[PDB]
Amino acid sequence: RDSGSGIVALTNDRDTAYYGEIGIGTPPQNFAVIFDTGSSDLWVPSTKCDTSLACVIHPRYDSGDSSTYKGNGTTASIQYGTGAIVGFYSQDSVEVGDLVVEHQDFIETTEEDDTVFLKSEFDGILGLGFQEISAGKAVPVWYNMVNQGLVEEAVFSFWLNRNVDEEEGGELVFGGVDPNHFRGNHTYVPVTRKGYWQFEMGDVLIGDKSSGFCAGGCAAIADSGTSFFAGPTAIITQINQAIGAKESIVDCNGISSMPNIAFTIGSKLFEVTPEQYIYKVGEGEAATCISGFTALDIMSPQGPIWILGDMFMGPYHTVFDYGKLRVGFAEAV
Ligand SMILES: *[C@@H]1O[C@H](CO)[C@@H](O[C@@H]2O[C@H](CO)[C@@H](O[C@@H]3O[C@H](CO)[C@@H](O)[C@H](O[C@H]4O[C@H](CO[C@H]5O[C@H](CO)[C@@H](O)[C@H](O)[C@@H]5O)[C@@H](O)[C@H](O)[C@@H]4O[C@H]4O[C@H](CO)[C@@H](O)[C@H](O)[C@@H]4O)[C@@H]3O)[C@H](O)[C@H]2NC(C)=O)[C@H](O)[C@H]1NC(C)=O
Ligand SMILES: *[C@@H]1O[C@H](CO)[C@@H](O[C@@H]2O[C@H](CO)[C@@H](O[C@@H]3O[C@H](CO[C@H]4O[C@H](CO)[C@@H](O)[C@H](O)[C@@H]4O)[C@@H](O)[C@H](O)[C@@H]3O)[C@H](O)[C@H]2NC(C)=O)[C@H](O)[C@H]1NC(C)=O
């Protein structure tokens, strides 16, 4: 018997990535998978991938051992940074949060860029975005969940633990919201373009006044798969100066003197402190403090795009409300 809580416990790897276990096939084949609101496919290493080290060192899906496996074979290609992942589609049963999602299309990977995925603790990615941005326009896991009636509410939500010393890395809830992990109300903004979890954002404040560049209305995406913030160079440039910044972007030891950065979502200020937006790769005084604000210029018909990753979704409990097409943020506890 498999039903029906919808809870997934998340592992936190040095605040950089969050992953949980899913099962594919019967009998189930277990994979560590990042839950990613920025992409829409499910993919895992395949037994048919013999030229990439990542597939060889990670657990691999074997269709010959699944009695529910149904061949497809449609090829697909997904760019990850400079390289890419490549594979073909298959169908099988997927168990996420003890919900058995029947006939799920997913990608068996044939090749993986070893620079990103060789030393990953996770094996795959479970995409939680919309169908429009799936490689083969596959029906995403969450849509099948909704379609099979496996959830009481048409929302899913994230608690990401930012304290890497604790034992709970985080928690992802399919079909509800865990009231233990936020305080006060969520602020809800509607989805502006449907493929991405995308909404309208206001002006970005450095210290107490305006960056000007987003005061006319920017676009932004909640992407559980990214750690760092990414936004237009025109704003990132100003942030770099007010912080003392110099591949990456460095400083340190002046964190407490830096200003808070604040995003204006739903006519409210969501503030991020230096402690929350500076990443610390070291530990002592040979430590390396790195800025989480990376420059990235992508257009959309709604304006230049901000990516708000785990550094934002950590302090701000995030609800993805599919039934009302809206995203909500609340102060996390
Ligand atoms: C190899 O894989 C690729 C990648 O997936 C296949 O190419 C894609 O296949 C999908 C699925 O057929 C295509 O999406 C559909 O497009 C339809 C036309 O827009 C649309 O009606 C579909 O939306 C409905 O269904 C989903 C749920 O899908 C169920 O049924 C399919 C059948 O295979 C399964 O794949 C799923 O697991 C699931 O069982 C709902 O979420 C959606 O809201 C729609 O639901 C209506 O219909 C349901 C009954 O069908 C009913 O239950 C609902 O209440 C509602 O009335 C879906 O978007 C996609 O277009 C296609 N890609 C391309 C580029 O064409 C490829 O076909 C496959 N190849 C082989 C050889 O198998
Ligand atoms: C945190 O968020 C909460 C929202 O989730 C806030 O509480 C809500 O506040 C609004 C506005 O004050 C209330 O909405 C109004 O309620 C009246 C009366 O509702 C009653 O009658 C209707 C039938 O007409 C019935 O369906 C209801 O069940 C009630 O019996 C409506 O007529 C108005 O049009 C309007 O919707 C919400 O009711 C209220 N919700 C809750 C759960 O309290 C809360 O104030 C926020 N807190 C802070 C600090 O901002």
| Structural domains present in the chain | 1-177 (2.40.70.10), 178-332 (2.40.70.10)
Write down the H helix ranges in the chain. Answer: 53-57, 114-117, 141-147, 233-243, 274-277, 310-313
Strand ranges for 68-169 from DSSP E: 70-80, 83-96, 99-112, 124-127, 155-160
Tokens of 226: 């990214």
Catalytic residues: 36, 223
Distance 139 CA to ligand 1 centre (A): 6
Let me know: does 142 contact 315? Beta carbons within 8 Å: no
Tokens of 63: 């269709």
How far from each other are the two terminal CA atoms of the chain, in whole angstroms? 33
3-state secondary structure of 133: helix
How many CB atoms lie under 10 A from the CB of residue 147? Answer: 11
- The residue whose C-alpha atom lies closest to atom 44 belonging to ligand 1 is 147
Let me know: does 171 contact 181? Beta carbons within 8 Å: yes
Let me know: does 106 contact 41? Beta carbons within 8 Å: yes
Closest CA to 12 of 37, 32, 31: 32
Tokens of 257: 């003197």
* 197 secondary structure, DSSP code: B
Half-sphere exposure (CA, 13 Å, Cβ side) for 95?
Answer: 17
Atom number of ligand 1 nearest to Cα 105: 5
Residue type, 276: Q
**Four-point Cα dihedral 177, 186, 181, 147, nearest 10:** 20
Write down the H helix ranges in 138-218. Answer: 141-147
Closest CA to 170 of 293, 272, 2, 310: 310
Atom number of ligand 1 nearest to Cα 74: 1
3-state secondary structure of 216: coil
DSSP 170-200: EEEEESS--GGGEEEEEEEEE-SSBTBBEEE
Half-sphere exposure (CA, 13 Å, Cβ side) for 37?
Answer: 27
Distance 199 CA to ligand 2 centre (A): 24
- Quote the distance between the C-alpha of residue 283 and its chain's center: 26
Residue type, 211: S
* 143 secondary structure, DSSP code: H
Pair type for strands 170-174 and 218-222:
unpaired
Distance 184 CA to ligand 2 centre (A): 15
- d(CA 316, CA 121) in angstroms, rounded, equals 25
Let me know: does 134 contact 40? Beta carbons within 8 Å: yes
- The residue whose C-alpha atom lies closest to atom 6 belonging to ligand 1 is 138
Atom number of ligand 1 nearest to Cα 143: 41
Let me know: does 240 contact 303? Beta carbons within 8 Å: no
